[PDB]
Amino acid sequence: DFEEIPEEYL
Amino acid sequence: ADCGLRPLFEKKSLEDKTERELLESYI
Amino acid sequence: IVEGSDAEIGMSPWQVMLFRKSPQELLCGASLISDRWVLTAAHCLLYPPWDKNFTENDLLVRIGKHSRTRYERNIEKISMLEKIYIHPRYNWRENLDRDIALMKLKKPVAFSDYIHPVCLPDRETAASLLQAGYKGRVTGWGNLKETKGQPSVLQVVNLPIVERPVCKDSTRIRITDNMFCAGYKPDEGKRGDACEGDSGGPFVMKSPFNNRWYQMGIVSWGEGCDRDGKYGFYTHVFRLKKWIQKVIDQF
Numbered sequence A: 001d002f003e004e005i006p007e008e009y010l
Numbered sequence B: 001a002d003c004g005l006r007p008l009f010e011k012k013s014l015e016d017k018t019e020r021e022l023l024e025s026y027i
Numbered sequence C: 001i002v003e004g005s006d007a008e009i010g011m012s013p014w015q016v017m018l019f020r021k022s023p024q025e026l027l028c029g030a031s032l033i034s035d036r037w038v039l040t041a042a043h044c045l046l047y048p049p050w051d052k053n054f055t056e057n058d059l060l061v062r063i064g065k066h067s068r069t070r071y072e073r074n075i076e077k078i079s080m081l082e083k084i085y086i087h088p089r090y091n092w093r094e095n096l097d098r099d100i101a102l103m104k105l106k107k108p109v110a111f112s113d114y115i116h117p118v119c120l121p122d123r124e125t126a127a128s129l130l131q132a133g134y135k136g137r138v139t140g141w142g143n144l145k146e147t148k149g150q151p152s153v154l155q156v157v158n159l160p161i162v163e164r165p166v167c168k169d170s171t172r173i174r175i176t177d178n179m180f181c182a183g184y185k186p187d188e189g190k191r192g193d194a195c196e197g198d199s200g201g202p203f204v205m206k207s208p209f210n211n212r213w214y215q216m217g218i219v220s221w222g223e224g225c226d227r228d229g230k231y232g233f234y235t236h237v238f239r240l241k242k243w244i245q246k247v248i249d250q251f
């Protein structure tokens, strides 16, 4: 349900 | 240090809507 | 949180969200105590009964948030963990005694209007404020009730510390001096409690002597949420501060 975080933090 | 002093509240002298309920309990 | 209300913007700027990288989900609450140290409940990181034992790279910490699910561009700061430290006598086997842990960040987080550290209580502030009847404030993005489901934004609720014999008599769990319980009694009318997902978040109090917010407890456990005759239990932060200081001083 979470909006995507900058994959960049991943 | 500056711990525990909110930029949006204590640092501007603004109170949140319920902090007074805490103060009123501290006797 | 059950029977709380939406938090105001920048109301709890030390609030931290413990976030699982994959699947991307909320794990627990936490709190910012300096620009590189975050405080949380040990059981949010290590809990063998449920095969929980997270390593640093499994997690992220999101600071300065309000909305539970939205990515708050230009407001929240996401940080990676350098190292996790769990109380050496954290009792996960029996009653979550000494349910506390520290998380050191890879890089210091920049303070802003929405990000700012809470103070840890000294002996005197604890003695003066941790008294039956005195109210603290609990915040979190945990469930809204025991069976709506989950909140849109950070929730807040003020709750009175409860007499130790009442805490004891409300449960079958062995209570220790490293815990305290809070909440209203059935006869007091008012309600509210922490719930699943709120664990690790802070129970704070505003000193009337110097007008600063202090973290007195950490959401630890309960039996259901907001049930009559049951109280939420919190880690007693002051009683475990010597360990906190030792970790921060050594590391």
Ligand SMILES: COCCC[C@H](NC(=O)c1cccn1C(=O)[C@H](N[C@H](O)N1CCOCC1)C(c1ccccc1)c1ccccc1)B(O)O
Pocket: C028, C043, C047, C094, C095, C096, C142, C173, C193, C194, C195, C196, C197, C198, C199, C200, C219, C220, C221, C222, C223, C224, C225, C226, C231, C232, C233
């Ligand atoms: C005010 O409620 C706050 C809940 C906060 C959450 N804590 C937790 O969930 C906590 C971590 C490990 C089990 N735990 C619990 O809080 C346990 N609650 C149960 O899972 N409930 C109540 C009984 O019925 C089934 C469900 C709690 C417990 C108390 C009494 C009886 C059984 C369990 C407990 C306390 C110490 C050690 C082990 C278990 B949290 O992780 O977000």
